[PDB]
Design an enzyme around this catalytic site. Structure first.
Site, short mmCIF file in Angstrom:
data_model
loop_
_atom_site.label_atom_id
_atom_site.label_comp_id
_atom_site.label_asym_id
_atom_site.label_seq_id
_atom_site.Cartn_x
_atom_site.Cartn_y
_atom_site.Cartn_z
N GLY A 146 3.01 -2.25 -13.98
CA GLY A 146 2.22 -1.59 -14.11
C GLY A 146 1.76 -0.79 -13.00
N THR A 147 1.43 0.31 -12.67
CA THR A 147 1.20 0.91 -12.12
C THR A 147 0.11 0.86 -10.80
OG1 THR A 147 -0.93 2.95 -12.14
CG2 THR A 147 1.18 3.14 -13.73
N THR A 148 -0.25 1.16 -9.53
CA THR A 148 -1.29 0.16 -8.50
C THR A 148 -2.24 0.90 -8.66
OG1 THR A 148 0.80 0.10 -6.88
CG2 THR A 148 -1.89 0.16 -5.78
N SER A 162 -4.44 -2.65 -13.96
CA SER A 162 -3.41 -1.98 -14.69
C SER A 162 -2.09 -3.18 -15.49
CB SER A 162 -2.57 -2.63 -12.73
OG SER A 162 -3.17 -1.53 -11.81
#
Ligand SMILES: [Mg+2]
Ligand SMILES: [Mg+2]
Lengths: 111, 231, 236, 196, 245, 243, 249, 240, 243
Positions: free
Chosen positions: F29-31, F74
């Site tokens: 996932g994204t940060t 995340s």
């Protein structure tokens, strides 16, 4: 000792013509000997050219009319926006009323 | 591989293969697009038939006087989800005398789809949804995937060959976002978008379905002869 | 058995639904033709032995006075479905003092299809042809699959021999077919696809008309229609 | 209330049940049969609250018929009376108790003996040479106490029954419109066609 | 609690548990039903593998559902007990609420519905039983004979057989049953049933069980003596036929 | 073999492989990061713009719990929404029974017990999210991070997602350089910077920065999203700081 | 949500019930215990195998009191035995004492615990108990009795027996030493002798656990004033008594 | 699949219990518990490797009740699960039976629950080892330990962790020399010092004030030391 | 989920057999043989113990023959614990029938109820069947003396003489060879003892490996469970053994 019912007065009247119908009601809402409102409408347009009134106990009447409007909505949803005939509405309202057969709506109903 | 027997199993890389199979069930469905300006929101769906003797399956479902959706994939799942959305709008109106916000509708659909992806015995929904609505904050277009992910956009497209329509909308953004107060022009932009996803087929009155909502415009569906104006 | 009964395939299909469609492919032939004068439903009885009394083979049933049903596949699975249909119809009447729409009855029936898992243990192994009339959309013919999906057909053939029968229907159907023409067409396609010589005992006809409702044809009427079709084919 | 009498003679059990059904100030019926045949040799008469009577009677009848079909055998009159008594005894402590009193007349073909059982709605059962339910007993129990004899024939029992019905028609306040009379013996259950 | 889907579909469109129940039916003793002009006859094969059976108390292959309707079966005996108990309960309930005994078609349809239910419910296996249900409708003299299958299918039969070697008996019946001249008397029908069983029942006497149903709840089981008389008549006719040329 | 096929199963090492696979899902996932300041906490998240059809400033990722707790996650976003719904239920229950808003450690343990219970049976799947949350209570500022195994700890700074490593490096730098602590606005600027820095692992796609904060002095102990002039100031700080 | 509603013990094609056999294997791998029935009492004994020298063995009791006249010892998995003794103590009350005002006889309590274990070999989503129990009891109308209960739920009355590792050697030793005229002290001596073969380390009052079902101990009752109420017949021997009898072993 | 759920192997073993035992050592921290004259001390290693961690939130010692403290050797999710369950059980025991739940009784209850996980298939064992300590009003200083097998027992002293054995041997020797089942000290400060000293010896390593967690149970109170309390204990130790 | 571990104990083999029923019958085939023989004036039950040892207390021992009421008894072959479960249910059902009808329960009704209980486990519930086969010996005033048998399938049958357990083929052949319809109860005792001695897999048929019982007839019946000394005496009387 708690009484779940009340009486808000009022009077409604429906008359059927040849190509028209009429449903009138007084706009006075009372409690005991005091006046609650001088303009509280109790004759409603429910759609599909159906006017409805449930006079007597205001809470029960408003509940019944809300339920009938919702039944019209779901009838349109479930039958391809089919117009609800006045007789079909009458039977649906009979079933709505008899649902609370042993805890009634203190309302006299006219559509 | 060995990790697609149910929704309750992660793969070694961290994927949920049943959810991806549901997404594939979507990708094989008929194409539909949605796009909105600042005053209206439009859905354009290509209906699909069984053979020349059959009807074209409905793709647009009305949820409330201010909100509707179009489906791509398993029609029964779309029926279930649209019924739940109808019930949520109905509850909002009845209890709070309040039109349900399209954003909260998306949140509710996300949370509804999520619970089928973490519990044994169930299965994810096999349909994707394009939700148009008009609420107290204006026009709204949402894309819903059975993974639970719901996203607000100016426009999008789902189904087979939807990439052409999506890229067309990405190019036409600056133009179609400004089609305010002219419904027919936004409808034309929508059919122009959906034309990019056509392969050996053309839009006819039998296979084109359109829906529109917006300011002073209840959610309404045009089918059959009604769409002849836009062909 | 190695996977849940509600498992998606890598192609995005429910395994049990596809397998039920395979089961339906093995069922007896059933053909419905809709015309402006009514809908016609015909079935191949397919008695499994000469000692079987073909009168007890009921693959055409009445849902309501204005809605009839034909089945193809695991016909036992159809029984409860028929019940849920019949009830639904009359129930609508009881609540609304009117006849239920044909499409509404079909949707009510299809709402049960995918209600299986770990609920019944499996989808239905039978497809249905629902013929009917209502004052909104006239005469209608619906094909209901165990996938929950239902289509509306001008003509439809289900069961063994459905591909060739459907091609024949595609070639023979037009919007101005009369009722007798549809009866003879059902009889002809059934006689073509059946392994046995079609008579009035291994095939059954029925119709939905606005005036008389749902009527299952007696064996004498069907036999006279069969003789009419024989004479028509002889003189061509 | 309703007249419910039973007399156990040397070779049979005779049940007599009033023929009237009355609601309010109207006698709705005068040919009502207040019995159900529980088995080929066991007959049950009933009286009590409206509705409960026939409902309980037909329920017991269905159960006894199911037992007979299952075991291809006829339960003794004692077993049937015990089953009915247990049903009634469970009834009294329920939400809505059955308000039904019954007489059970049977011919035990294994014992070759007539048997009469009086069971009230509480689940109180007794075996009696003669029994009655309601106010009827207040007149008949003495009559029979004087005239009953254990060696009497079926015709003698019918004569005693006629005496009881005559006394009830003389002294009871209400018109019960006569009685239907049935005899249960080794050959089953027959009905006397005319008692008047 | 336990709701595992046992009867499911296979890639070819088969429900293997129902078919294996059909196999269980195939491995059971033979049962035959023959419709006469004014009667129905149900014959049943009894296994000869054991001699020390108490015939007065061992459960019979033919059971009365009501005074006018009889059910026989082939397959697992205990599943048949379950079905028969359910059917008798339903018969009494129908008598209670309709004030009329069941028609043979109605009882057959109820049994078939229960059998079908056990093929689409979680946690249960289908019945390994096929049944023949015979009798007469109330105030009716037309004979009625029906057959039900583990799948839930049921149908009406002029004459039918189920169980092991049922194909042989059905061939015999198809070669010997004339619909235009069904057995006029009870004797003809019982003799035809005994012949059908003789086609497969190797021993013969004391292996055959016969029940005769006649209108107005006239159900009677023939003792081994009348059955042996039928067997002797048939064998004598056979010996004559063997050397009358 | 086959030890990784069923949740809540122990491998011969003593591991639950399904939890580690969920952790892989999280790492995909994204940060998202959180930074504890002198009187509050700051939360920041990167949102990839897959296409310009996405409506900017909509598709909000950070969620609020009660009126003082912020949560970001995340991994599988719907799993995070499920966890936030459960946490809102827990906080509402706690307030209804005890009148006071739920303290941050109490809420942390509620979330942790829920996630851990989701590793006790083979009939449920672990959460595919790592969750950074916290806020201000009667005992001051609190920042927590919670893993799919149910493990959770309190942090001076926390980070997950594809760019978690550079984020943790920058957070360690910030911790070493400011032993006295950051102010809320300085923490917002540093969160913007760290998000822009960790975006380099998703450099092929544009990203949108989303920041929220709960500060005793700047937000009066309440959770508020950083928008308008302050958001643009943080964006400009990060922009001129990457050069 | 418990989705294990199906049996975890099923018949193999050979006819074996695998989980019962494996529980029996676990029992055989457990520390030896034994019981000997005398004419005026019963004795049950086992070895206290401690886990750590720092652990206090006196806290953990292998011989438990079930009722004032019934005690139990085991071989196999300790915690299974602990939940089993809890269940047995509670069922002695719910299923008997609260109905008749007296404690159940030995055979009926043994049957209750055997029913518990039987259900453990057939119910959904559970494994059998990995223990074998020796129950020593006395009731007024049956006298003294000694029963063995196995993981399958079966029980057997014994004049003397042993379970666990080295059970066949102990049983052989008991068969040659047991008669029908043994006094309680003789049975205690035979039990000590039989247990000595099963141990290799220390053999003293601190390493072995021994209890008896003998006479009523009114000093152990705790109250006086009811002549019909005698003390319990169950008594657990102390380290001192064990060592005293070991002096003349 | 006899290795996946809690059913017997052909050898009569439960491999999931053994694998949970293996999991208990995953944290690579050691702990020990000892008893004084009127107190009970537990010390556990505290290792905070990540500099971004708030070191005050890193603990494996729990205050179950006013008298009972519990140190866990295992992963923190299962540790906090067991801690919450123990706190609930102790509170309910007090409410129902009118007196504080004793150490051995809570240990027996938790061991029974662990045994339940060992016999029912739908619940996994907890990969933790629970060491409960108190000064029981009837038994005095008490140490009771439970494991994923449902086993529990009392201890003169005890140790748990990867290097447990080392510690154990050390303690054993000391008692073999002291011939008493406790530490002959009247102040809990000196007992804490004894514990830290013998752990330093057995592990062959020195500890700072941030390398230890200490829990002390005295009559009617269990508490945990701070960094400064630990630091002055270490100062008193160094002055030896 | 847990579907991976379901043995599916109520399914059909491709040949149309119930796996668990067949395997339970295989299990019972190793249990000590039990024999029932019904004469005109009584019934005889004789079973062989497999739990044999010198230290076993045979006085208070009962592993084969159990009383159901005063008119019915059962010989067991198989798992004694499943048998005791079924026996308790049977006793409760007999007492229910007595309380409901004030008549002793007919034998066949109790046998059918127990057999239906057995069948239920072979069609639903996902549980294993009871590894038990019963021989019922009873008396009622409708059929007089009666012998039945039931097995894990739930199937029950009536016999003049029958055997369950191990070596039933040889025992049944011998019984067919020597059984007469007119024989008396003592002749049945002799026949059962001879059959057991000729089919036993042990060295000799000694009293310590036997359980014995007779139901005799005053219009009342008597149930006698033979004690070890009575078994020894009847063994020397038949001539199986010598004193
Ligand atoms: Mg406990
Ligand atoms: Mg487990």
């Amino acid at each position: 000792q708690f009484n779940p019912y009340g009486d808000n007065g009022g009077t409604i009247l429906g008359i059927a013509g040849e190509d028209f119908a009429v449903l009138a009601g007084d706009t006075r809402n009372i409690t005991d000997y005091s006046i609650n409102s001088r303009y509280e409408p109790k004759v409603f347009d429910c759609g599909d050219n159906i006017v409805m009134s449930a006079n007597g106990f205001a809470a029960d009447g408003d509940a019944l009319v809300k339920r009938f409007k919702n039944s019209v909505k779901w009838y349109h949803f479930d039958h391809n926006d089919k117009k609800l005939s006045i007789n079909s509405a009458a039977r649906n309202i009979q079933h709505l009323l008899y649902g609370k057969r042993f805890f009634p709506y203190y309302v006299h109903t006219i559509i | 591989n060995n990790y697609d027997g149910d929704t309750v199993t992660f793969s070694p890389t961290g994927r949920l293969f049943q959810v991806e199979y549901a997404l594939e069930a979507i990708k094989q469905g008929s194409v539909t697009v949605g796009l909105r300006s600042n005053t209206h929101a439009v859905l354009v769906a290509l209906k699909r038939n069984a053979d020349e003797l059959s009807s074209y399956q409905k793709k647009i479902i009305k949820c409330d006087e201010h909100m509707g959706l179009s489906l791509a994939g398993l029609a029964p799942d779309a029926r279930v989800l649209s019924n739940y959305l109808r019930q949520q709008c109905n509850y909002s109106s009845l209890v709070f005398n309040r039109k349900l916000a399209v954003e909260r509708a998306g949140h509710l659909l996300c949370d509804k789809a999520q619970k089928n992806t973490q519990s044994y015995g169930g299965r994810p929904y096999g349909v994707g949804l394009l939700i148009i609505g008009y609420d107290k904050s204006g026009a709204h277009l949402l894309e819903f995937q059975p993974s639970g992910n719901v996203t607000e956009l100016y426009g999008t497209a789902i189904g087979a060959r939807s990439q052409g329509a999506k890229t067309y909308l990405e190019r036409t953004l600056d133009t179609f976002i400004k089609i305010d107060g002219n419904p027919d022009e936004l409808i034309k932009a929508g059919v122009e978008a959906i034309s990019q996803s056509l392969r050996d087929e053309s839009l006819t009155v039998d296979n084109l379905s359109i829906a529109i909502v917006g300011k002073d415009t209840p959610f309404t569906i045009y089918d059959g002869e009604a769409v002849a104006k836009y062909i | 058995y190695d996977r849940g009964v509600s498992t998606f395939s890598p192609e995005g299909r429910l395994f049990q639904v596809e397998y039920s469609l395979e089961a339906i492919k093995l069922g007896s032939t059933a053909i419905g033709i809709a015309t402006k004068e009514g809908v016609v439903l015909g079935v191949e009885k397919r008695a499994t032995s000469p000692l079987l009394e073909s009168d007890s083979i009921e693959k055409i049933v009445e849902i309501d006075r204005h809605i009839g049903c034909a089945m193809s596949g695991l016909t036992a699975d159809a029984r409860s479905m028929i019940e849920h249909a019949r009830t639904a119809a009359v129930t609508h009447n009881l609540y609304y003092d009117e006849d239920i729409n044909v499409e509404s009855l079909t949707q009510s029936v299809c709402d049960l299809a995918l209600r299986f898992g770990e609920l019944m243990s499996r989808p239905f192994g039978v497809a249905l042809l629902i013929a009917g009339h209502d004052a909104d959309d006239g005469y209608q013919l619906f094909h209901a699959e165990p996938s929950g999906t239902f289509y509306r057909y001008n003509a439809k053939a289900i069961g063994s021999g459905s591909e060739g029968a459907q091609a024949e229907l595609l070639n023979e159907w037009h919007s101005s077919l009369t009722l007798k023409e549809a009866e003879l067409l059902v009889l002809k396609i059934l006689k073509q696809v059946m392994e046995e010589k079609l008579d009035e005992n291994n095939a059954q006809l029925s119709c939905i008309t606005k005036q008389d409702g749902f009527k299952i044809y007696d064996n004498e009427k069907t036999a006279e229609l069969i003789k009419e079709l024989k004479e028509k084919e002889a003189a061509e | 209330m309703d007249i419910i009498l039973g007399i156990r003679v040397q070779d049979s059990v005779i049940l007599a049940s009033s023929k009237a059904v009355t609601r309010g100030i109207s006698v709705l019926k005068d040919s009502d049969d207040k019995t159900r045949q529980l088995s080929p040799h066991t007959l049950m008469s009933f009286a009590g609250e409206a509705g409960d009577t026939v409902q309980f009677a037909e329920y017991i009848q269905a159960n006894i018929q199911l037992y007979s079909i299952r075991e291809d055998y006829e339960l003794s009159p004692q077993a049937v009376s015990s089953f009915v008594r247990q049903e009634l005894a469970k009834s009294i402590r329920s939400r809505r108790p059955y308000q039904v009193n019954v007489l059970i007349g049977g011919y035990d073909k294994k014992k070759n003996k007539p048997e009469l059982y009086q069971i009230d709605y509480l689940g109180t059962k007794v075996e009696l040479p003669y029994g009655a339910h309601g106010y009827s007993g207040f007149y008949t129990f003495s009559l029979l106490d004087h005239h009953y004899r254990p060696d009497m024939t079926t015709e003698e029992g019918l004569d005693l029954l006629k005496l009881c019905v005559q006394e009830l028609e003389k002294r009871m306040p209400m018109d019960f419109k006569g009685v239907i009379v049935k005899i249960v013996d080794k050959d089953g259950i027959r009905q006397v066609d005319d008692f008047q | 609690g336990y709701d595992r889907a046992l009867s499911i579909f296979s890639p070819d469109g088969h429900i293997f548990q129902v078919e294996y129940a059909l196999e269980a039916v195939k491995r059971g003793t033979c049962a035959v039903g023959v419709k006469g002009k004014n009667c129905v006859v149900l014959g049943c094969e009894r296994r000869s593998t054991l001699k020390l059976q108490d015939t007065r108390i061992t459960p019979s292959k033919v059971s009365k559902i009501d005074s006018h309707v009889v059910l026989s079966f082939s397959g697992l005996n205990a599943d048949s007990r379950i079905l028969i108990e359910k059917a008798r309960v339903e018969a009494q309930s129908h008598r209670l609420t309709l004030e009329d005994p069941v028609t043979v078609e109605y009882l057959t349809r109820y049994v078939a519905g229960v059998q079908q239910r056990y093929t689409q419910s979680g946690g249960v296996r289908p019945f390994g039983v096929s049944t023949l249900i015979a009798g007469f409708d109330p105030r009716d003299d037309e004979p009625k004979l029906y057959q039900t299958e583990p799948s839930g299918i049921y149908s009406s039969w002029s004459a039918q057989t189920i169980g092991r070697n049922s194909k042989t008996v059905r061939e015999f019946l198809e070669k010997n049953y004339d619909r235009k001249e069904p057995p006029a008397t009870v004797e003809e029908c019982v003799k035809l049933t005994v012949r059908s069983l003789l086609e497969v029942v190797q021993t013969g006497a004391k292996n055959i069980e016969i029940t005769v149903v006649k209108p107005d709840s006239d159900i009677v089981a023939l003792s081994s003596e009348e059955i042996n008389q039928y067997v002797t008549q048939i064998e004598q006719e056979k010996q004559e036929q063997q050397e009358q040329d | 073999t086959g030890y990784d096929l069923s949740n809540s199963v122990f491998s011969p090492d003593g591991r639950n492989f399904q939890v580690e696979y969920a952790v892989k899902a999280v790492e995909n996932g994204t940060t998202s990061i959180g930074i504890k300041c002198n009187d509050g906490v700051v939360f920041a998240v990167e949102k990839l713009i897959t296409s310009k059809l996405l409506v900017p400033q909509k598709n909000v990722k950070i969620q609020v719990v009660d009126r003082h707790i912020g949560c970001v996650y995340s991994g599988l976003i719907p799993d995070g929404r499920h966890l936030v719904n459960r946490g809102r239920e827990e906080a509402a229950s706690f307030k209804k029974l005890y009148k006071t808003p739920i303290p941050i450690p109490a809420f942390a343990d509620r979330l942790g017990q829920y996630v851990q219970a989701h590793t006790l049976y083979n009939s449920v799947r672990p959460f595919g999210v790592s969750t950074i949350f916290g806020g201000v209570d009667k005992n001051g500022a609190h920042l927590y991070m919670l893993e799919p195994s149910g493990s959770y700890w309190g942090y001076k700074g926390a980070a997950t997602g594809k760019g978690r490593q550079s984020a943790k490096a920058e957070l360690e730098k910030l911790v070493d350089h400011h032993p006295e602590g950051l102010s809320a606005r300085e923490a917002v600027k540093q969160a913007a910077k760290i998000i822009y820095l960790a975006h380099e692992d998703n450099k092929e796609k544009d990203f949108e920065l989303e920041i929220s904060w709960c500060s005793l002095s700047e937000t009066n102990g309440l959770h508020k999203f950083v928008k308008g002039d302050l958001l643009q100031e943080a964006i400009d700080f990060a922009q001129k700081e990457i050069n | 949500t418990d989705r294990y509603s199906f049996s975890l013990t099923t018949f193999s094609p050979s006819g074996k019930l695998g989980q019962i056999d494996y529980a029996l294997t676990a029992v055989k791998q457990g520390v030896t215990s034994l019981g000997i029935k005398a004419t005026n009492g019963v004795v049950i004994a086992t070895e206290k195998k401690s886990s750590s020298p720092l652990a206090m063995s006196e806290t953990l009791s292998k011989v438990s009191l079930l009722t004032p006249d019934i005690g139990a010892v085991y071989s196999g998995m300790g915690p299974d035995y602990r939940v089993l003794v809890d269940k047995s103590r509670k069922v002695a009350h719910t299923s008997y004492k609260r109905i008749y005002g007296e404690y159940p006889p030995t055979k009926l309590l043994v049957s209750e615990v055997a029913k518990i274990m039987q259900e453990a070999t057939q119910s959904g989503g559970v494994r059998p108990f990995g223990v074998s129990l020796l129950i020593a009891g006395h009731d007024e109308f049956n006298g003294f009795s000694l029963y063995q209960v196995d993981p399958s739920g079966s029980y057997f009355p014994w004049k003397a027996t042993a379970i666990g590792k080295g059970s066949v050697a102990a049983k052989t030793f008991l068969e040659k030493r047991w008669n029908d005229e043994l006094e309680l002290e003789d049975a205690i001596h035979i039990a000590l002798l039989t247990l000595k073969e099963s141990v290799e380390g220390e053999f003293n009052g601190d390493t072995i656990e021994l209890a008896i079902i003998g006479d009523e101990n009114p000093d152990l009752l705790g109250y006086t004033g009811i002549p019909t109420d005698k003390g319990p017949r169950f008594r657990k021997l102390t380290s001192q008594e064990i060592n005293d009898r070991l002096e003349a072993l | 699949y006899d290795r996946h759920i809690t059913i017997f192997s052909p050898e009569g073993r439960l491999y999931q219990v053994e694998y949970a035992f293996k999991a208990t050592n995953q944290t690579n921290i050691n702990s020990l518990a000892v008893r004084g004259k009127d107190c009970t001390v537990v010390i556990s290693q505290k290792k905070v490797p990540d500099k971004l961690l708030d070191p005050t939130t890193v603990s494996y010692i729990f205050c179950i009740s006013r008298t009972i403290g519990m140190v866990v050797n295992g992963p923190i999710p299962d540790a906090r699960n067991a801690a919450l369950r123990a706190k609930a059980e102790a509170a309910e025991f007090r409410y129902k039976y009118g007196y504080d739940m004793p150490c051995d009784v809570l240990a027996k209850r938790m061991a029974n629950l662990s045994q339940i996980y060992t016999q029912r298939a739908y619940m996994r064992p907890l990969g933790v080892i629970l060491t409960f300590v108190s000064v029981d009003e009837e038994l005095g200083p008490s140490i009771y330990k439970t494991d994923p097998a449902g086993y529990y027992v009392g201890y003169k002293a005890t140790a748990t962790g990867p290097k447990q054995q080392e510690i154990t041997t050390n303690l054993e020797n000391h008692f073999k020399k002291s011939k008493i089942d406790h530490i002959n000290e009247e102040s809990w400060e000196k007992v804490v010092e004894f514990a830290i000293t013998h752990m330093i010896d057995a592990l062959g390593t020195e500890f700072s004030k941030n390398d230890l967690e200490v829990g002390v149970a005295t009559k009617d109170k269990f508490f945990t030391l701070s960094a400064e309390n630990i630091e002055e204990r270490l100062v008193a130790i160094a002055e030896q | 989920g847990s579907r991976r571990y379901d043995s599916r104990t109520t399914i059909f083999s491709p040949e149309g057999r119930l796996y668990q029923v067949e395997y339970a019958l295989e299990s019972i085939s190793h249990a000590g043989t039990a024999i029932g023989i019904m004469a005109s004036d009584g019934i005889v039950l004789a079973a062989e113990r497999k739990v044999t040892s010198t230290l076993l207390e045979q006085d208070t021992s009962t592993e084969k023959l159990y009383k159901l009421n005063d008119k019915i008894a059962v010989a067991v072959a198989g798992l004694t614990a499943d048998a005791e479960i079924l026996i308790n249910t049977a006793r409760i059902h007999a007492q229910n029938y007595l309380k409901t009808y004030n008549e002793d329960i007919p034998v066949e009704i109790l046998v059918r109820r127990l057999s239906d209980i057995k069948q239920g486990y072979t069609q639903h519930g996902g549980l294993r069947p009871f590894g038990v086969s019963f021989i019922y010996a009873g008396y009622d005033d409708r059929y007089g003396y009666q012998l039945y048998t039931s097995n894990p399938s739930g199937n029950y049958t009536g016999w003049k003489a029958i055997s369950v357990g191990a070596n039933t083929s040889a025992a049944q052949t011998l019984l067919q060879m020597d059984y007469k319809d007119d024989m008396k109860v003592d002749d049945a005792i002799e026949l059962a003892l001879k059959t057991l001695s000729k089919t036993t897999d042990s060295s000799a048929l000694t009293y310590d490996r036997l359980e014995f019982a007779t139901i005799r007839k005053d219009g009342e019946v008597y149930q006698k469970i033979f004690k070890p000394q009575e078994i020894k005496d009847i063994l020397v009387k038949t001539g199986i053994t010598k004193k």
